[PDB]
Amino acid sequence: GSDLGKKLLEAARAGQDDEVRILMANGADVNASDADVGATPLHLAAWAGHLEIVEVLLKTGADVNAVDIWGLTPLHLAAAVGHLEIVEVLLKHGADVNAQDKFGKTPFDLAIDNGNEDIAEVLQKAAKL
């Protein structure tokens, strides 16, 4: 019952989707943020490639455009690692294709730099609106 936000961060990173659902049923803050770097459960689930967890967090009110101490959003992270279906779900839920990290880099820039050309094309088309 204690420290549910830290527990939710860990469960999201680790892919523990049943535990995510349990923690949220017991009141865990979907917008919990790491005390040192500001990352949220959605950041971790997007980076780590856990689509079900991404969808659970969005449905319970996670801020799709939350930023961490490096200016990274969940969309940056999914675009860098190269999770196309997560990119698509984040965009459908209002992810900001124009968001810049602390170095000026968009999710598109990270997709380009990581050889994720299919995602980069999705992001370029979304930036035209």
Binding site: D36, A39, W47, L72, V81
Partner: peptide
């Protein structure tokens, strides 16, 4: 570790 993400790798990596 292969993912090019910048200084934030210290928290996220992972790959």
């Amino acid at each position: 570790k292969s993912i090019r993400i910048g200084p934030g790798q210290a928290f996220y990596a992972x790959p």
